[PDB]
């Protein structure tokens, strides 16, 4: 339970060895459900974008859109538990600093709340930071209660380094995931056939971000 124990006994060794780390039952049912209620309220009050344009070849009404997003700072009214999650992620990273590779984390992005609408859209294979923009660690929190991939799809498939086999991660309720943001972890989201929510924050390495400024 103690953030420092989780960090030192699991996250750090797992990340340095696999570059990926999954933590289940991170905040508990109560808090996880509260975060779910907050994200759902954001959706129901129209705070999300309409979704990534998947197919344009169509004509306005025929357009297909995918993942919808909304940026959350964490202090907005109705988003405080999301803020609590962010602070909890920050706490783990703080306890890991100086131990995640040779990176020195000194900041992060706001939270990106994503919603795959369940219309069969996913996210194409990609690398979060392929050009050295400063991001070294991707942190994702999932909040989909009773998610069954064999039925609803939406698996996050990561292809670690240049190894043959890949890793499938179900977007399970109260699951926390960390992985290196660079080319070591290309990944994709398989088609989702039910509403799928995730909250992502990216952590910056001090040196990479300092020189990224000279790239604009």
Interacting residues toward Fe ion by CB under 5 A: 128
Q: Which is nearer to ligand 4HG, 176 or 189 (CB)?
A: 189
Would you tell me how many other CB atoms lie within 10 Å of the CB of residue 24?
11
108 annotated ligand binder: no
Query: Out of ligand 4HG, Fe ion, none, which partner does residue 68 contact, by CB within 5 to 8 A per kind?
Result: none
Quote the least distance from Cβ 175 to ligand 4HG, whole Å: 10
Q: Which is nearer to ligand 4HG, 100 or 158 (CB)?
A: 158
* Six-digit token string for 202: 């990216």
Quote the least distance from Cβ 79 to Fe ion, whole Å: 22
Quote the least distance from Cβ 126 to ligand 4HG, whole Å: 6
Q: Which is nearer to ligand 4HG, 69 or 194 (CB)?
A: 69
187 annotated ligand binder: yes
Q: Which residue has the tokens 């190894």?
A: 163
Query: Out of Fe ion, ligand 4HG, none, which partner does residue 171 contact, by CB within 5 to 8 A per kind?
Result: ligand 4HG
Rounded to whole angstroms, the maximal C-alpha distance in the chain is 54
50 annotated ligand binder: no
Quote the least distance from Cβ 66 to ligand 4HG, whole Å: 9
Would you tell me how many other CB atoms lie within 10 Å of the CB of residue 146?
7
CA distances from 26 to 33, 47, 132, 133, 190 (A): 12, 26, 30, 29, 24
Determine the distance from the C-alpha atom of residue 211 to the mean position of all C-alpha atoms in its chain, rounded to a whole number: 25
Gap between the Cα atoms of 100 and 93, Å rounded: 9
- Sites of contact with ligand 4HG (CB under 6 A): 67, 69, 114, 123, 128, 140, 156, 171, 187, 189, 198
Q: Determine contact, residues 179/158, Cβ cutoff 8 Å.
A: yes
Quote the least distance from Cβ 20 to ligand 4HG, whole Å: 12
Gap between the Cα atoms of 48 and 208, Å rounded: 30
Query: Out of ligand 4HG, Fe ion, none, which partner does residue 69 contact, by CB within 5 to 8 A per kind?
Result: ligand 4HG
43 annotated ligand binder: no
For Cα atoms 172, 178, 165, give the angle at the middle one, nearest 5 degrees: 80
Annotated binding site for Fe cation: 126, 128, 187
């Amino acid at each position: 339970l103690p953030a420092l124990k989780l960090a030192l006994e699991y996250i750090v060794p797992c990340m340095n060895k696999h570059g990926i780390c999954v933590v289940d039952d991170f905040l508990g049912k109560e808090t996880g459900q509260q975060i779910g209620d907050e994200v759902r309220a954001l959706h129901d009050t129209g705070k999300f974008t309409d979704g990534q344009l998947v197919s344009q070849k169509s004509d306005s009404s025929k357009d297909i859109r995918g993942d919808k997003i909304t940026w959350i700072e964490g202090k907005e009214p109705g988003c405080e538990t999301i803020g609590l999650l962010m602070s909890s992620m920050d706490d783990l990273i703080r306890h890991c600093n100086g131990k995640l590779g040779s990176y020195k984390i000194n900041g992060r992005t706001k939270a990106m709340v994503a919603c795959y609408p369940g219309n069969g859209t996913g996210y194409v294979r990609h690398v979060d930071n392929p050009n050295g923009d400063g991001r070294c660690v991707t942190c994702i929190y999932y909040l989909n209660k009773d998610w069954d991939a064999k039925v609803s799809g939406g698996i996050l498939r990561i292809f670690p380094e240049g190894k043959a086999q890949f890793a499938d991660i179900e977007p399970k309720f109260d699951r926390l995931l960390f992985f290196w943001s660079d080319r070591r972890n290309p990944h994709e989201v398989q088609p989702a056939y039910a509403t799928r929510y995730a909250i992502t924050v990216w952590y910056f390495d001090a040196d990479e971000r300092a020189r990224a400024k000279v790239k604009y």
